[model samples]
Target: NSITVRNATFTWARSDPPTLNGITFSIPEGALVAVVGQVGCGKSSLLSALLAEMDKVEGHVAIKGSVAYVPQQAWIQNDSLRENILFGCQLEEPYYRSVIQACALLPDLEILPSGDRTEIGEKGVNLSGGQKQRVSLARAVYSNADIYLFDDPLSAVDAHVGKHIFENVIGPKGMLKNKTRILVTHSMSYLPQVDVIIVMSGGKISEMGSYQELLARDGAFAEFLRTYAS
Candidate 1:
């Protein structure tokens, strides 16, 4: 198993109510899991629980491998784009090139004055939100971690760009195909492409199954889809 959460409960503070209420789920190695919910529904908190960032109140979270987390807001540094992606890892020329390509960073790089070496941050050319998000994602891909925790990474980009990233980086046949991925998203279009869909409501997982299974059940997941489509 890549991840196992057995009746886990978490809170931001000791005095606060559980942000993740009795969450239980297991993900096999290389499984692509999608976490979906409305805003402020503790979707991000679930990822925080997995990262051990939340205060655990009960149960166990066993992660069998290393993880790479991409937050809702991308984190950028005051360094060249290349250095940001490398982030202290040795530069394997071919692999580095591929990572950028898979991330759809190549087009942005072409427009930069110094391309990959272009300084980015307060002292350098400013990048748009989508660009920054893609850079954050590219860095994660380059790190080659066993699991990825993405908090709505696609939300910052255009629809076309989002699709490109999905097809080339996060999709099943994408670059990290064999890695365990947990993506928190509001997009319904890609739900069917994922191996498992975990529907969250009010800090709890209300449903978990394949996309077709949930639709057939016509329960919380189906209701969510209907609401989202509206």
Candidate 2:
């Protein structure tokens, strides 16, 4: 398994009780998993727990290789877009170009005065919300980590841009296809494209299976789909 959690209880702080109660799951290498749930349902907490930012009051988490995380709120530095994406690393032409392309940043760059060299003001005040998220995502992709933990990276973008990123960067035919990915999303439409769908509720996995299997069960996940579709 590339990622494994065994009966883990996770919390934001030591004073608080675990948000993710007795969570257990295993992810094989090169698998794409979608995590869906309502707000504050421990969706983001699960990703934080994997990164060891959350307090693990009980159980264990074992992860293989390096990790790249994209938070729900995109973080940006006051710098040129190229500098932000490169983050002090030397630009490797092929990978750099592909990363930006996959992240759907080319259109934004094309409109900028200096292309990739355009200076983004403090906290990327100069860029739109979606652009900031894309740059953040580009940074993560440029890092090329073994595991990608995305906390609703698509929410900031419009449907069209989100679809482009998903199909080109996170989809099965995308650049990260062979890497381990756990995406926390509200986009029910994309769930069926993932290898596994894990439905979270009350801080624990209520049900999990392939999208088709879960839909057939008419369980928590099915209800979730209906709610999402509605």
Candidate 3:
């Protein structure tokens, strides 16, 4: 379930500078990782390359087993919430129940007048930001991939839901239960949950390590924590 990327580089067609500069890092199996950086630091590009979806890419990110990707953007279709969560995949109802419970979906489903059958409306415009993210999270959990890569999927929810989802769902017991997680977030509180922390800058890997280790350096990393992370 672990992934090791060695000197990975990705360049968009004809772009002089690589969107993902040479970067190397290993993500341990079952450990949560939070990749943080400012805008234009190639966060999405790095994620795409890691998933092996790129027009021009070099090097490699070793994958030991299957992967489940929870995209930042949640795509919805005109169907029941349950259907959308289990779309394209067929499984027994029992298993679906378990997955739904793990994602804390019962409560939300219970309130929908039709209870899971309520139409999400065009492109899920009827759903709120938190609802959309929760639906996407459920879909990812249903995939049961050995690894779950969350690309800033928690930006929509309220402070309460954000904390609740992280503690219950994405934490040790939620959908990910025991799976490897790659969480891309800028929330400082969220970083503490991650086993490893990576700070990217200007398309380059500026620094990385356990939270305490990086903070010990007392450089820009420290400034980051004091200024915004804390």
Candidate 4:
């Protein structure tokens, strides 16, 4: 899948000022693109715009192929863990098991009283934030969509678990290897591995290029890394 945005602007409501201002970028098929920035820099809103959750005020936006999104806040159902991941789809044992493993949900399942059948969500056993995020990711992965928009899904988990999930689910060789992936991340460790780095600041793109290219310029992205490090 390829995503193309040209001079795009978006707003939450018709009367409000634009939230995304003149954003422009192109993501080729099967590429891993990372959107990075400080808090409230419109990274999440950018993802929302791609999903058409916000109204476009100007410019063009095109996403070719189906999309699967893993939001910053995971949404769970008042159903069993398995049901939440399956989301009404028939379970193919082999693939289902792999998804669970890839998302690092096996240990969580064992901890549940009834394992995969354990009821979860508001009316059932409550899961931690990271657990919920993993379940949410598993659901998206199981959907087999051509494009994946991950809203900092890895931030909810422990460091080791985050690395594990990244290696198996989102990295270059991960399960979504052939799928187009747009990730919003605060972690800098994985930036060098991404195909493109989009540095967002104050609702606009400050810089866009490969990690090496951005670092060579010693501009906004380099400054970001310095401030982020300290």
Name the candidate that leads on lDDT.
Answer: 4
Q: Model 3 misses residue 12 by how many Å?
A: 3.2
Give the count of colliding residue pairs in each prediction.
0, 0, 0, 0
Model 4 residue runs over 4 Å out of place are none
lDDT at residue 45 of model 3 (Cα atoms)? 77
TM-score of each: 0.97, 0.95, 0.88, 0.96
After superposing candidate 2 on the true structure, give the runs of residues whose Cα lies further than 4 Å from its correct spot: 123-125, 228-230
RMSD of 1: 1.1
Model 4 global lDDT (CA atoms, 0 to 1): 0.92
Candidate 4 is scored at a TM of 0.96
lDDT for residue 44 in candidate 4, whole number 0-100: 96
TM-score of 2: 0.95
Give the Cα RMSD of candidate 3.
2.3
Q: Which scores greater on TM-score, model 2 or model 4?
A: 4
Among all windows of 10 consecutive residues in model 4, the one with the lowest summed lDDT is 221-230
Model 1 scores a TM of: 0.97
Model 2 C-alpha lDDT per residue in residues 40-86, reported as the tens digit of each score? 68898899899998888999889999999999999778889998999
Q: On residues 72-138, what C-alpha lDDT tens digit does candidate 1 reach at each position? A: 8998999999999999999997899889988889889999999999999988999999999999999
Ranking by TM-score: 1, 4, 2, 3
